[model samples]
Each structure stands twice: as structure tokens, then as C-alpha cells.
Target: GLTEEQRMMIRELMDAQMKTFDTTFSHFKNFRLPGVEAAKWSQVRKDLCSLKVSLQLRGEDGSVWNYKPPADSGGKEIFSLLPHMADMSTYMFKGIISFAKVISYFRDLPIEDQISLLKGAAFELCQLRFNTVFNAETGTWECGRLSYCLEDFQQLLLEPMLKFHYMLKKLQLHEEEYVLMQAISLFSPDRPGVLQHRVVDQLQEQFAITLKSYIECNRPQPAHRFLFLKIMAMLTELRSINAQHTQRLLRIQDIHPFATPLMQELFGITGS
Candidate 1:
């Protein structure tokens, strides 16, 4: 579904994003190796390794907590926790916006279409990005200074949410795959009110193909033969989780209002 020009643009976008992902999220400060041809398979592999290393270093090494309720404390702790979680969500929201800003294709879209795509995909992108810190062994999100367990989020279906995170954790996705998956999620054309459906669809298809080729080429094991399919299926699970998150935010608003304007805009939630 992607033309040659479209394909080239997609590759360039990925390359650029990979660089940004390294510098912005990770502690690395060096420019990529000089004189190296960009986007070759070898270079891609090197960049993927850089991405993996940087992401692994982001927050995985931080202290983790299983978050247990105080015996003497009332349920107010949960309410107090809501604002911090909303702030964290706002941080991820800004990251997604920064990501979109780098893509000329997205910038060229009509403003309404841009907002629609972002509104439709914001929660899903957050879920994907948060998985980087997910600790599968303990079923915790290893965020800096605080680890969130399933019990912390009382509004969603705990079992299904844990299962989804565990499934993604089990896949052990490389950083490039994670970026490509987020790319595909962001460019989804079927989101309600999205104009320029054909262009968005082609862009999504291009990212999907990039992910598929990366997996097939790098992971040639017999067991990995259907890995691309398995990963693609994760997006469906993410959509379900996104729906639950929207409902959760609405309920959260009933208790404590959103602390950040960006959070309100990202989720399209407004005080009544």
C-alpha cells in the first residue's frame, strides 16, 4: 500500500526517531558513529542495539515497590495517588506530541485530523511506552522511585491488564520493534473522525511492514516464525485497554480533577 516515496519517508522517520529516542530517553550523549551509512541493515542493527541499551537504562534499574496499603490508613491513599499518576500520564503525553512533531507527514495533516489521531491513539501509545518499565516477574511497573502493582489501579480489570502486560513482556521486544509498534498505533486510520484515511492507512502499512521485516530478518528462529502476527495482535489488546483507561480517567475525574491541562486535552476529559 506504500509507494516508493512513502517507503523512503517512513524509513527516514524511523531513523530520525531512533536517534531522538536514544538522546531524549536515555543518558547517551554521543552522536551516532560518523561516516556510517544510515538505514542499512547493519546500521539498523547497531541503532537497535543502542536503542535497547538506552531503553534498558532508562528506569529499569530503579528501586521497585509492590505498593501495599497501610493498615491504619483509610482508602484516601488511592485518591492521593491519582494526581501523581495523572502527572505521569501527562509526561508520556508530551513525549508522544514531541514524537509527532518530528514527522513531516503528521505535521502536513489538517489540524482536526492531527487532533483526532492523537486523541484516538494517546492512551495506546502510553501503554506501549510504559511497557518498557514493566517488571513481568513481579507484575509491577518499575517507574522511578515508585513501582505500581495491579492493586494500585482499582478501576480496571486487573487480571486482563496483567495478562496483557505479561504477554508483551514475554515477547522481549527490541527497542526498534517497540518504536515501530507505537508508530503504527499512532497512524491508525480507522479512528473516528479521521480524514485523509488513505494517506494514514498507507503510513501505518509502511510501519507495519518495517516491523515485520525487522522481526523476520533479525529473529529467524522456527519459534519466531509467527512473531509478527503475535505482536500485531497486541494492538487489539491495547485498544481494549485504551477503552478501559478512558473510563478510568472519567471516574478519576469524579474524585480528583486532572492536575495538568495536557492530561485533560490528551484524554479529552473536561470538568463538568
Candidate 2:
């Protein structure tokens, strides 16, 4: 079992990411990023809506809990990826496209097709970013770890940067937007630029966005400041997990009666 403080930290960490998501939701819409390419969204949705209904049919008493798991008839699975599936960008590169352009491609489709396209677009953003983000310590893929690297991941936005420079010439963004404009701004090898406050602000603002509906479209600032804390949490958690392994080995060597149980508890199947 996780300690009280550890559990609370996890909750806070997840909440922080969501808040950041709401703040920058419009970044996708504003720049008309490829987040909406045709067959792109629909195809991604087809894979993404992959959901499974795990049936808890047997009770602790070893008896049947129910006649069936609602999906006795063999429920349908039409989507591509599963939610939180490996924390990778399950949407593929489609989200990197522009939404405005996507509308044009799907314009000729029937209303039903349009609805089918949108069936599961709601949760695409976060899960998409979740995987692309690099896990600094492990040097591989991870949700929370990648989020930490995201604070400085500029290589992924080269094209976006070019569009941003062009868009800046077009739309006059507000202060935070302006700040985000700077934050996501990068100008290196091609056009090197440092992280900007505006990008941070935009990401931070998602904390307050209303999520009542993935059904409805359209939906924050000290928020971003608070987000810095989560970034630190990611780094700290990485360190803690790494240190625990060595410490566990040391404790196990003590060879006391209670040491074995403590060792078992430390590295159990239900890992903390």
C-alpha cells in the first residue's frame, strides 16, 4: 500500500496535468494544428475507442457475483488504442495536424460520419502527449516522466514553431497567449529559441477549463506557477524510485525476521 503522503502526491500530480491540459486546449484550435486531419481523426478514433469491460464475476467467497458482465453477448470493441494505453500518443501523428484543415476534408461526409469521427476525440490530447514525452532518467517512454521532459521538449514542435511565427504575424494573442507564444517558441538548428512564459501560461491555464463535456467544444495562470511544482515532483519521484531499489537490497541483507516481510512488502506485486 502507498503511504498517505505518497497517495496524495499522486493525486496532486494527475490533477496538475489535467489543469495544464485545459489551459492549452485552444492551442490546438488556435493554430489549426493537424489535430483534426481527415480520416486522421476518424482512423485514430477507430483505434482509440478500444475499451474492455473486465468482468469481476467471482466473489471473494468463490461464488458467481452476477449472471454476466453486462457484455455477456460479447461487447463490441471498435476503437484502436486503449485509454492510458502505455501512456503513449495513441492518436499517432494526426493530432499534430491542423483542425481547420481537417474540417474541409470531412465536409463532404454525412452528418453520421462526422459524429462517428468525433465519438472519442475528447480524450485524445492528454493521452497523445503522454507517450511522446521523453522519460529523462530512463531515456525511454513514460507518462509522468515524459511530462517532466515536456517542460523542455522543443524538438517535437519544429513545424509548429514555423506556423507560430507566421501566425504571430496574423492574430494578436493576449498576454498569457503571448507568453505561450514565447514558451512554445523554439529557434534552433533551424530557428533556436528558449522556452517562453506565454507557452507556460497557456499550459497552466488548462487547470480551470470546464470539462463537463467532451460532447461540447470550447472550454487558467498562477496555475502554471503551481505546475512547476508537479514538474519537480516528477524529478523527485524518479530519484526516489531509483534509490528505493538499492535501499531494499540493503535491508534484505540485514536478514532479520521482520526484514523478510518488510522486503516482501517493499517489492510486492501491487507495487507502489
Candidate 3:
């Protein structure tokens, strides 16, 4: 018994995470670092930045859709998710709404650049560690040398993520960036369950369904607060994305330069 708004909210979130992941992952294919450690993290940052904007842009005032949203698209107030006014709820899917800007940013990029970025992302996962304990003869920087043996780490990229569904879980549930912290915390290199994916299923069955239902049925008052929350949530996502870039991109002199002005804009590029 999902409301139209709720269902759309969920779909939008799924799209956001998938789109962001795909868009951002595109940039990491060219990651060139000396060691495996650098390679491992380089990919992480690229993805983090893309998803940050990609996800953030999905929110209102973020997308590059028709300059003025379609007649059907509400002005961030009611939203396309709301089929009618009654669908309005106390909680706006802030993560989804805020992703609008991100969509516009990538949509504007050339197809080659977009694909290049994603390929780069796929390669970043090829390294064993940034320190480069061992890379033989194949692939790009950070990616394993072109040998069948070095291919394990790179599997996630070539493989479909829909199976693991961690990233999907986040965007699908509108869980926010902090959820990454929770997921990262769940895994330990030393622990056996790092690659396992059951918590997401549990939460979806027990909590996510209920949360969606409750938010829809209540339709709490003072919708403005929900809007404010979207704003704050959007900022939080932006911060995490930017911070991830700082940790990853800033390390590379060329891309690091890109991060500065990007930050300035996020901070609001006010001056000439």
C-alpha cells in the first residue's frame, strides 16, 4: 500500500544512487597512482564526488531538467513525486530532491568524457593497495596488470551492483551519506562478513517499508520543516562528497585544482 509519492520517492532514490554511482565511477578509469594504496583510495574519492553532486542534484534547484520544471513538476514545494496536494508528507525525500543539480552537471558533459570517467572508476578498483605491493603487466594505473590473476578486485566494476545492492539500498531508502559510515563500519578487512549483504535486506523488510508507510499516512503539519530538512540534508551530502574529494582528488595535482573551485561553488561562488 505505497502512496504514489512514496513509491516515486523510492524510485527516484534508486535512480539517484544508480545514476550517481555510474556517473561518478566513470571518472576513476584513469586513476594513476604509484602504489596500490593510492589506487584503492583514488577510486573511492572519484566515486564519492560524483555521487555527492549526482545525488545532491536530484534534489530541487539541483537538476538540469527543463529550465522551468514541467507544468507537472511542482516547484520543490509539492514535487513531481506528489501526484496531488494530499500526498504531501512531513518528510521530503531530501536526498532525491537535491540530486537535480547533479543530473544537470553530468548530463551536460560530453559522452566521451562521461564514459572516460566511468572507465577510470572501474580501473581504480584494480589495485591491491595504493602502495603497489605487486602489479604485473596489464590494465591502467592502479588497475592490475593485464593478467587473469589480478582481476579479482576489479570484479565489482564489471559485475552488476544490483546484486550486492548496498549503494542501491542507500538511494532506494533515501538513507543519506551517513549510511555509508554505517556500512563501512559493518565491514572489517579482518572480518568475514565484510562482503556479505544481509543487513540491507533486513532493514528493507522490517524498517524501510514501515517508515515509508508512516511518513505517508501521517502527512504531518508544517511542511516547511520538511523543506528545511531537505536543505540541511542536501548540505550534508554535499559536505561528504566534497570531503571525500579532498581526501581523494586533492592528492592529484591536476584533479586537486578542480576540487578547489568546485568547493568554492558549493560554498557559493559569490565573487568574480
Candidate 4:
């Protein structure tokens, strides 16, 4: 049995990573009026509109999160040989690797179950970098830093991906809530053909309990109480986008090989 000590260890590792996740959320912070994208909103809705922004309290270290724009000098910084999916996939693979290491017992799980989790969770995990790639208000892809054409990204991938970020903006989930959501997505127990049925279910239950405690401590208001229920309900929509994302990734990888070993492994693409 997985002990309580081990569960705390996992939670602590995520707390460290979530410090960085909170930083990313801060860097992308924007406050939007509740009713319409173009409508004028007064000071009244400011409180309601800022739920997502509210959680980005400055880190204890007091260092601000910085957004570095691509340089005008523009060599490899703007024009690397990697395709868009490869670049995104490479970054996602590295993040997943770091997380899996912290939960090293995950490596001992049946390899196929491990693969199923990765397969099901890959797009959701890649969504961690979504703040950089998506501009929610304008409702367009932001590839300025990558120096890629929006149309090319659209044809390859961005359409379904864009829809997801819009849904996320509407939900306005707090940074702490989003962090736990991402963890739940990664440790998914529902992926088809997964091995060790009872084991994964028990693990995800621990995450649910932790999330309940997190919301209680951080967001105790009566209105904020149903956040966990909302998150659970949204998974069906998220899984739809995940399916579209996987098909697009396979299409892209067929045309151009992934640039890194980790991307290749995560996507199950092999050989020269």
C-alpha cells in the first residue's frame, strides 16, 4: 500500500513545482470583465472578474515573474529548425520527466499503464505552457516569440487548442486549483486499457482529498465552494480537446520527426 508519508512526498514535490506554476500564471495575468469580451465593465464586476488573477499573490521571495520577448537580434532565438509541435512536445516531455522523477515509484508501474497515462495526459500536460502560446482576449495564437506564422499553426494544430484556452479563461480557475487540476489530469485513472485498476483509483482519491483541503484553506467563501465539482465536470470537455490534440500530433509527427528523445518517447514515435 502507498503510505501517507509517500503521498505527502508527492504533494511536497508538486508544491515546489507549483511555485513555478504560480509564477507562470502571474506572468500571463489579465483581468477581464464578466459579460462580454468587448463590453464595458465597471468597478462592480472587478471582484468577480478577478478570480483567476486573485490567486497570483507575489511569491514569498518577492521576485517578480518576468516575460522575456524574443530578441530583435533574432538568430537561433527566433529561427530554430524545430517544427512547432516538436518545440511544444519537447518542452512538455521535459516537464513530464521532471514530474515522473519526483514520483519515481511511477516508473515501477506496469510500463503499458505508464504509457496509457502519458498518452491520455500528454495534451493536458502540454497545456501548462498555454499562457505563452495563447492570447485569450484577442482569441488568436501568439507565436511572436516563436517567429512562426499563425496560419501554419492553425492548419497544424491551433484551432482546437485555442478553444481550450478560451474555456479555461471562462472558468477562471485559481492558480492553486489549476495546479491540482493538472496533477489530476496527469495521474488519470480512466485512460482506456490502463493496468493496475484499483491502485490508480486510490492514488487519484488522495489527490482529490488534498484538493478539497487546498480549496478549504485558500478559498473558503461560500461561492468558491463548488470549484472541485466544476473542475470534475470540465474533464469531459477537456478530454474532447485531448483527443483532437492527439490526432493533430500524430499528423505532425508523420510529416516531421520530433526533435528530441523525450518527445519521441512521450508520443511513442520510434526509428529513424
Candidate 5:
């Protein structure tokens, strides 16, 4: 049973996602609600719809950076942007933590299980959240005041990440779907070090069902039939990208340390 507090949390998540969609996507108003028969799922949607946050992306001098192609340098240009990217990620990481705090199911988990689940799920959720800002046509990520093209992150094992982002963009996912996917990702039972696997598995299953039902009720029959499958496939791709991202970050750390303690912790980098 979802408590009032939990519902409030979901609302907060939804509000934030909706604002992002509004600012980022011009077609946001065209999205329609699912039918009343999908009430349970709709409830989750309503909760998520209530979340909100204003993330600002600016450089040291408080200037908005436009998307620019990196100069012809092996790794120098990419390495130079790492600190800025890391700073952006710190805000993103805080968002993820706020997300976890709302899940009543997560609160019930053992402390160790909670830590393990978050540790494993952080990157995947970040990717999904970041997808909201990804522009597949232009191949750029537009944040609040700055933008980044694929080439900007090329050295960070971003090939797979961009591929997944493009695939998701092609799907033209609704804000509800994106928020639901984040919930599903956070509740995975198989993350290494998870102790209460059964509980986590059940929680993930509940969210997955809601997502499928929402899709079925809202999308056209032909497209809805396979949309859920394609979305789930993206989750698999996320796992692959997670491994590659960690490896590449480690390699980058050798040359340049992460800018924030949070970044260092997220990537599991040890102190030199």
C-alpha cells in the first residue's frame, strides 16, 4: 500500500520531470493521459507528476556554452571538459538521491541493501534522466544553459550510451514513462550486494506492470504491442553502458581526477 508520504514523493518526481519535458520538448502538451481503467498505474503517474527541480548549467564565468565541436586534439579537449561535466553530475546525483528518498519500498530495505541498490542503479537512472535532455536529431544534450554534442563525451565510453539515448529518443517517450522507468531501475533486485532480493524483485515487478499497463492503455495498438519490449531492451543496454562507463572513468581518473567527491564516490575511485 502506498502511503501519503510516498505519494507526495512521487508527485514531486513527476512535477520535476514535467517541467523538464516542458522546457526541453516542444511537443509535451500533445501527450495524453492513460485511461481510467489503468487507475493503479495512473496513481503512480500522478505521484511522479508532482516532483520538481530547477537545474542550472553554467560555466565558471556564468556563461551559457553552445555546442561546439572539439578541436583536433587526441584527448586534451575532452579531458578539459571533465570538471565541468563532473559539476553537472553532482547536481544530477543529488536528484537521484532525492528520487531514492521518496520510495517507500526502498525505505523498508535493509541499510546495506539500500546502499547497494543505489550504488548499482545510479548510473542507469542518470542515463534515463539525461535522455530527457538528449536531442537525437542534432546529436546534442541540451541542459539548462549549456549543450554537449556526442563528440564531447566520446572519450568516456559514450558510444553505447549515445546509442541507447538515440534509441530512447526515437521512441519519443512520455514523461510518465521516463519517470516510471527510473522507478523500475532503482528497484532492481539483482544489483550486486543487494541482500533483500525478494523484496526488491517484487517492488520492481510492481512498477514494471504499471509501466506496461500505462503503455497499453495510452498508445495505439500496433505500436504499444512492442514498445514495452523495446524499452526493456534499453535497460539491458544501460547495464552494458554502465560497465563501459565505469571502466572508462577509471582510465580518465589516471590522467585527471574527478572534480567532486560525489563523482569520485559514484565512479568508485579510490584516493591516490
Candidate 6:
């Protein structure tokens, strides 16, 4: 029920908030691996993959060690199975922390609600950055190395995400739009167990309203009016993808006891 004046005021507030948003996100976007400038996470991923393959090969070659002692087996442990090649949950953990740093109001939420929100929305929020990871020009991720499609981590989620990335390339949403969109996801009120629902709702709605106004004011073309709806639909797909991802993780849990502790907390994968 925001009046026109109130909406305008909210837009102005969003404008003011952009400074913090830009400053905080600059850290992530500008981040680079030391000694390797060619690709985003390329060297890290390559080293990790090499170790994994080496371990698997060593294991395959060691059946002759069947009677040998465990230490003498000469097989390596496969850390690459750690999911997403780099322990995405760890990145998501850091992401939410950096997220709170950027948006002060996020930290102002009740501790209980903040925990709930991270549990519910952290993955989706992290997924938003995938658009940046995907390079439509080279059809690669992070750089001209990984194909736009992910390797083996959450394969089902990549298609819809690549589609969204194409739209991002087409619409070319301003950097502020990307920051605000992430804020909209961060402040989501529908997260299960959210105790500060009204506060989060107000924040998310303000983001939605301000982003819509920003889009209309900036784009103005009739063809772009649906842009807002398209972006919203893309986030909705993240929600669905989140569900499927959890299902996949639960299956992983069922099959093995190897998920990390942080993974267990985020996915609620406690067991007997």
C-alpha cells in the first residue's frame, strides 16, 4: 500500500543503499587467484581435478595391493567428490557473511530469522552469481575454460541458469540491478521458520518495487516491460532448483556419510 510519494522515497533510499552494495560486491567480482590470471577459479579447479583423477587412477592401479596394508595401498583420497569442485557450501557460507556485511538490515534481523533465512535462501542467492560465472561470449564458466554448462555439480540446475544468463546478457541489467536482485533474494520472507516475516517482507517488497521502478525508468521500451517478470521467473526457477538440489543431497546422504558438517547444517541432514 505504498503511495506514489512513498515509492519514490523508497527508490531514493535504494539509490543511497547502492554505495554499500557496490563496495561490498566489488570484493567478489574483483577477486582473482594469485599466480593465475587467465581464468576465474580455473587454476584452482584444474589443480583439484588433477588430484582427483590422479587418485582414481592410483586406486585403479592398486588392486594388486589388495593384500598390502592400508597405508601401502598407494591410493589417494578423492577430495574432488567434495561437491561443486570447491565446496560450494563453504563459498555460500562466506557469501551470506559478505551479504550481511553489504546489507546492514540483513544483520538487523533476529538471529533466529537470520539463521532461517540463510538456511532457506543461501543457495538461491549464490546461484544468482552464476550469471556472472557464465560467459555467453565464450560459452564458458569463470573464464574461457569451463563450458557454460557445469561439470557434474547440480547438472539439472545449470540449464535454467544458463537461460537466465543469456537473458542477463541480452537485457544487460546494470550492476545495480544485479545487486538489488540479490538483495531481493536475501530478504525473502517465505523462508521456513522465519520469525521476522513482516520485516523481511517489507524489505523484499521494497526491493521488488524499487527494482521494478528502476527497470521501467531505465529501460522504458515496451519490449522490456516484461523484463521484470522474466527475472522474477528466473529466481522462481532457483527455488525449484533448490528443492531438487536438496533431494539430490538427501540421496547423497542416503548413499554415504561423507557430507561435511556445514553441509549437514545447511541441508539438515542429521541422522541415526
lDDT of 4: 0.54
All candidates: TM-score: 0.72, 0.17, 0.24, 0.59, 0.73, 0.64
Q: 49, model 1: CA deviation in Å?
A: 37
For candidate 2, write residues 1-272 as lDDT tens digits.
43464344334434433444323223322111111145444433332222222212233365643211122231222211122221222222233222211322234344443333332121222222432332334323332211111222234334332222222323322333222211121101111121333432343233212111111221123424334333334323333433443343334233211222322332231322
Residue 28 Cα positional deviation in candidate 5, in Å, after optimal superposition: 23
Best by TM-score: 5
State the TM-score for model 2: 0.17
| Tens digit per residue, CA lDDT, model 3, 83-184 | 211111101112222333244333444544433332222112111111131222332212122111222233443322211222222222223322222222
lDDT of 6: 0.57
The stretch of ten residues in a row with the least summed lDDT in candidate 1 is 48-57
* Top-down TM-score ranking: 5, 1, 6, 4, 3, 2
Error of 1 at 177 (Å): 1.0
- lDDT value, candidate 5, whole model: 0.66
Return the number of clashes found in candidate 1. 0
Which is superior by lDDT, 1 or 4? 1
Model 3 off-target regions past 4 Å?
23-26, 31-98, 101-259, 268-272
Give the winner by lDDT: 5 or 6: 5
Error of 5 at 94 (Å): 0.8
TM-score of 6: 0.64
lDDT tens digits by residue: candidate 1, 207-242: 888777777668978878789999989988888877
Superior by lDDT: candidate 1 or candidate 2: 1
The 10-residue segment of model 4 with minimum total lDDT is 47-56
Model 1, C-alpha of 202: deviation from truth (Å): 1.7
lDDT of 4 by residue, 138-218 (tens): 544443222222221233233544555666667666655665676677678888778786777777777767776666666
Question: Candidate 6, residues 1-272: lDDT per residue as tens digits?
Answer: 44585466455445544433222232332221212033523433333332111111112234321111112121233222444333534544565556655455776787888888888876776666556555566444452222223332334324554555565666676666776777778788998898878999998987888778777767878778788888788778778877866665565455334566676777786755
